């Protein structure tokens, strides 16, 4: 039964992993659609911000971790914060100790380990949140996918949130073209907005839902927020 | 509390389910062992098999040399055997610094038993499944065999066997010792001691075994050594030199 292996986080089941872990992967889809894309010199993050009401003000779906780094969340909010603080801590120490910015790869592997530890601990839980973490280090432009069970993948492009498969079809076609444009920010950015509106099929797009963040070879972590995303549609 | 076999606590009957199941199916891993005492040696024969041609059988170990002089024969599986080995090794070494003296079989047996018992009462650990036979030729007792078993029970032997050919081994040695009026045979050279062992082994388990199917560990005064593959065939051919 379901109820037999569900109660604490310390049990495996014949499936090969615990039920609860799959339910954490499921939550990401509930939360906000965020697409990730890169060329080879810059990498672009596009995110849809949702609120609850007219008289509600948006919840931020981009949290800036450094002046050369930020991430998007999709899924459970409270864990996304507990993670973004950990990444802040990890970053700073690297700079204090080693004079080092913190590679996307390097961060992913530390984050994974933290995730195993909280899935062997019985009172502990999977985070229930997936993250697309972007950066330009001296490894080049990067996009990584983090999943809350410790699955870390380096990608050209991907999506988490509402119809991930949706965006993925778009990206996989337009792929070969946009990624060889290397040294023009605007094009890769324009492909990001073109993609995200076609994943949608029970929502619509608008200016102040959308928010774009780009990092690169000549773009330090910069958000286009509200009004200023119009000129990338 | 919980239950009597989801965590380790007494059974309805005052028994412990976990120690009795630790006795049974940890000797059925394709292992059978005997230990007999020499005159100035101690011999162990133990089965030890490799099912692939791709498994290097050197690393395959189930007679361990705990110290330079101490041996420990484990009946039971390698995950357990290394938890007991780590403890044994540590105990041996600690003893050597602190008390200034080499570790007797009996002291090691007793210490490990009491420790297992504590882990038996714990509700977040198990007793190890392994059966541990500790061997050397002590200068404080002669050739010695002391065996611990998994319940926190342990006791000294003069000759022992484990695996369900226990009865066969025992009876052949018992009749023999009642006639000769000794429980140790007299012969100097290790070679003749291993031949005595084999004689009782072959009869009792009713088969002979290959070099790589055996592993023979010999205790001598201030050394314990394992016999190389050729060395274990030499002995099997040497009785057959007689025939």
């Amino acid at each position: 039964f379901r109820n037999n292996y569900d109660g604490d986080t310390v049990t495996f089941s014949p499936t090969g992993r615990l039920f609860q872990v799959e339910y954490a992967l499921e939550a990401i889809k509930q939360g906000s659609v965020t697409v990730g894309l890169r060329s080879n010199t810059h990498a672009v993050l596009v995110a849809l911000k949702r609120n609850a009401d007219e008289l509600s003000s948006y919840q931020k779906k981009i949290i800036k971790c450094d002046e050369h780094m930020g991430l998007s969340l999709a899924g459970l909010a409270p864990d996304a914060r507990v993670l973004s603080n950990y990444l802040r801590q990890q970053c700073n120490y690297s700079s204090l100790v080693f004079n080092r910015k913190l590679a996307v790869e390097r961060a992913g592997h530390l984050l994974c380990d933290k995730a195993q530890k909280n899935t062997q601990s019985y009172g502990g839980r999977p985070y229930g949140v997936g993250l697309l973490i972007i950066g330009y280090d001296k490894s080049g432009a990067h996009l990584l996918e983090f999943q809350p069970s410790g699955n870390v993948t380096e990608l050209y492009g991907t999506a988490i949130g509402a119809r991930s498969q949706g965006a993925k079809t778009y990206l996989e076609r337009t792929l070969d073209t946009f990624i060889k444009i290397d040294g023009n920010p605007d094009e890769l950015i324009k492909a990001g907005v073109e993609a995200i509106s076609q994943s949608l099929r029970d929502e619509s797009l608008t200016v102040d839902n959308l928010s774009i963040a780009i990092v690169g070879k000549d773009t330090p972590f910069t958000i286009y927020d509200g009004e200023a995303v119009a000129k990338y549609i | 509390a919980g239950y009597d076999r989801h965590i380790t606590i007494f059974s309805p009957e005052g028994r412990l389910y976990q120690v009795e199941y630790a006795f049974k199916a940890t000797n059925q891993t394709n292992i059978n062992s005997l230990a007999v005492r020499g005159k100035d040696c101690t011999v162990v024969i133990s089965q030890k098999k490799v099912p692939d041609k791709l498994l290097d059988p050197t690393t395959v170990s189930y007679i361990f040399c705990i110290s330079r002089t101490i041996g420990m024969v484990v009946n039971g599986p390698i995950p357990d055997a290394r938890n007991a080995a780590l403890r044994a090794k540590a105990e041996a070494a600690e003893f050597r610094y602190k008390y200034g003296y080499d570790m007797p079989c009996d002291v090691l047996a007793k210490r490990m038993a009491n420790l297992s018992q504590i882990y038996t009462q714990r509700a977040y650990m198990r007793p190890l499944g392994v059966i541990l036979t500790f061997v050397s030729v002590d200068e404080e007792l002669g050739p010695s065999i002391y065996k611990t078993d998994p319940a926190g029970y342990y006791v000294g032997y003069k000759a022992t066997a484990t695996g369900p050919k226990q009865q066969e081994i025992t009876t052949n040695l018992e009749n023999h010792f009642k006639k000769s009026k000794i429980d140790h045979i007299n012969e100097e050279s290790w070679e003749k001691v291993v031949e005595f062992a084999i004689t009782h082994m072959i009869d009792a388990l009713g088969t002979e075994f290959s070099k790589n199917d055996l592993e023979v560990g010999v205790a001598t005064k201030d050394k314990f050594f394992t016999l190389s593959a050729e060395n274990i065939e030499e002995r099997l051919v040497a009785i057959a030199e007689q025939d």
Binding site: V82, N118, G123 | -
Partner: protein, 243 residues
């Protein structure tokens, strides 16, 4: 008892869902933020001659620029206030200035995560989550007048007006129609009284309602019993002349 790490097939924790159930049973708290102030109003409720009804209120001051009104369990809102005062006091000492209402909600929400058995990520010291939700209203010199709804789950949203409590479904619906972007402090307080009257099964007195306001020449200020009643006196006559 009940899992503390066990999610629904959707992936929403039992404990979070149960948190949402206690909230819905308190008396309404309604905030409208305007361009001259934030109004927070509550239904205090209960009138008895064996009750001191003007010694109990649900609008408590955190700081000289921050209040909160609550809805749900009141005992729980005491632990939330103790954490919140300590965090705000320590920040005023370090940088000499006002703490941000969003910032406060995140610091509190971090300690809302502990419940149950511990983690290796976190030391979970409590047993349940908090069963009260809050409207925290304030002023800062860098975003002016603001109104915030903290859920005990972790989510906190900024609003221009929001109602929470039992009677929130109706209340919110009224808030929208009455809300516009040239709304002022004086109008907003009168309107609060309209909403409160409508949904009551009683006559609105200041021993079942309490008003409060924020002006930045005085900080968080409680609209006192004497003033709140004068406002009630003015309401009853004007309403009862539209009929």
């Amino acid at each position: 008892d009940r899992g503390v790490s066990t999610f629904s097939p959707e992936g929403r924790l039992f404990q979070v869902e149960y948190s949402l159930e206690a909230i819905k049973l308190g008396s309404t708290a309604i905030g409208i933020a305007t361009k001259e102030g934030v109004v927070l109003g509550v239904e205090k409720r209960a009138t008895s001659p064996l009750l001191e009804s003007d010694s109990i209120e649900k609008i408590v001051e955190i700081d000289r620029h921050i209040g909160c009104a609550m809805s749900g369990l009141t005992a729980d809102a005491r632990s939330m206030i103790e954490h919140a005062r300590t965090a705000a006091v320590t920040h005023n000492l370090y940088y000499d200035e006002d703490i941000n209402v969003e910032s406060l909600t995140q610091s509190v929400c971090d300690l809302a995560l502990r419940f149950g058995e511990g983690a290796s990520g976190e030391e979970r010291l409590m047993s349940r989550p908090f069963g009260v939700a809050l409207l925290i209203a304030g002023h800062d010199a860098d975003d002016g007048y603001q109104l915030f709804h903290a859920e005990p789950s972790g989510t906190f949203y900024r609003y221009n007006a929001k109602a929470i409590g039992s009677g929130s479904e109706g209340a919110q619906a009224e808030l929208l129609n009455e809300w516009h972007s040239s709304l002022t402090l004086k109008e907003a307080e009168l309107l609060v009284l309209k909403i409160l009257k409508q949904v009551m099964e009683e006559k609105l007195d200041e021993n079942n309602a309490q008003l409060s306001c924020i002006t930045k020449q005085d900080g968080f200020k409680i609209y006192d019993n004497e003033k709140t009643a004068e406002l009630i006196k003015e309401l009853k006559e004007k309403e009862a002349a539209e009929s």
